[PDB]
């Protein structure tokens, strides 16, 4: 199984949920929830709304692009399998998540500046 990304919410989506549409252009389009699919059918861009991940992360309301968010990305070439190398993924992903946990809070606090 492979987790894909929705073009509307720009977030991962599990299989067997929402609705999936494939255009004649020979590529797949996914939607986490039926509301996203309906909005995409109406051509309503969410990237200008305060709630969507794309707007929040880029503007400052949420964590922006950072070195931590540079590993969960698809790759074009395969990797040689190794049982020992599997353990590295478990530790590496956990450490990356722990590192990121200390950056989202910092970004939110920076956004909160001036609330005093």
């Amino acid at each position: 199984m492979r987790i894909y990304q929705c073009h509307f919410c720009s977030s991962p989506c599990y299989p067997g949920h929402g609705i999936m549409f494939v255009r004649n252009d020979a590529k797949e389009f996914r939607f986490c929830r039926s509301k996203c699919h309906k909005a995409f059918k109406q051509r309503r861009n969410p990237r200008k709304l305060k709630w969507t991940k794309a707007f929040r992360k880029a503007a400052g309301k949420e964590l922006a692009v950072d070195s931590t968010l540079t590993f969960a990305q698809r790759r074009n070439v395969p990797v040689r399998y190794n049982r020992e190398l599997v353990a590295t993924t478990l530790k590496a992903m956990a450490r990356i998540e722990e590192i990121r946990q200390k950056r989202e809070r910092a970004f939110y606090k920076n956004r909160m500046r001036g609330n005093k």
């Binding site: 199984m1 492979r2 020979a26 698809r74 074009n76 070439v77 395969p78 990797v79 040689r80 399998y81």
Partner: protein
């Protein structure tokens, strides 16, 4: 030398299999006869592993490559990417192609020295083929055919192309591709020769329904003897 077989009694060998000089790709299922046919002549000197591509049985049309490397379609799941590297030795490169149409058996058809690509193929993989495959790349719609890869098969011994190829074109391809070709038909006169045949420098596989003259012509052009 040449072998006649079928997958599910279907003559579309080129759709359910993709045989190369360094690896063998065939469909999957309980019917091991198709895999056994390749295993017999090929034996064990080269890896013979049946695997799925994008979950479909059209692995033959879905994948393409040569001795230097292997190419797989865009829809190839990341799970199959691990299998691709595990089965093939590290000496053979593996690269995924982001084609417009998810079928390498239609966009790319090549051999150990020359490759034919769709006119609208991505420039990235088009240039990378010169290293992954080590072959020359030419955008050429044979006789105007949009599906270049599904109507021809190529190898260092030559190949069989759709009947629309003129004899003069076949003779010129002896120098344009460094290997002469022959115009013929497979699957009892089917114009789509590449769909029903898979053949390499030392082994040829064709549909059972293929007529004897077609098999003899295929053997002669590939100079097996």
């Amino acid at each position: 030398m040449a072998t006649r077989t079928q997958f599910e009694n279907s003559n579309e060998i080129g759709v359910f299999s993709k045989l190369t000089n360094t690896y063998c790709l065939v469909a999957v299922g309980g019917s091991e006869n198709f895999y056994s046919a390749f295993e017999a002549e090929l034996g064990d000197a080269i890896p013979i592993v049946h695997t799925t591509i994008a979950g479909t049985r059209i692995i033959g049309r879905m994948t393409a490559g040569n001795r230097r490397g292997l190419l797989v379609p865009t829809q190839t799941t990341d799970q199959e990417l691990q299998h691709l590297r595990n089965s093939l030795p590290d000496s053979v490169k593996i690269q995924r192609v982001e084609e417009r149409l998810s079928a390498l058996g239609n966009v790319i058809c090549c051999n150990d020295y020359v490759a034919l690509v769709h006119p609208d193929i991505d420039r990235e993989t088009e240039e990378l083929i010169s290293d992954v495959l080590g072959v020359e790349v030419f955008r050429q719609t044979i006789s105007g055919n949009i599906l270049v890869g599904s109507y021809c098969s190529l190898s260092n011994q030559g190949g069989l192309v759709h009947p629309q190829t003129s004899v003069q074109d076949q003779e010129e391809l002896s120098s344009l591709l460094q290997v002469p070709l022959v115009a013929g038909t497979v699957n009892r006169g089917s114009s789509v020769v590449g769909a029903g045949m898979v053949v390499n420098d030392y082994l040829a596989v064709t549909g059972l329904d293929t007529t004897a003259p077609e098999l003899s012509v295929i053997e002669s052009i590939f100079r097996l003897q």
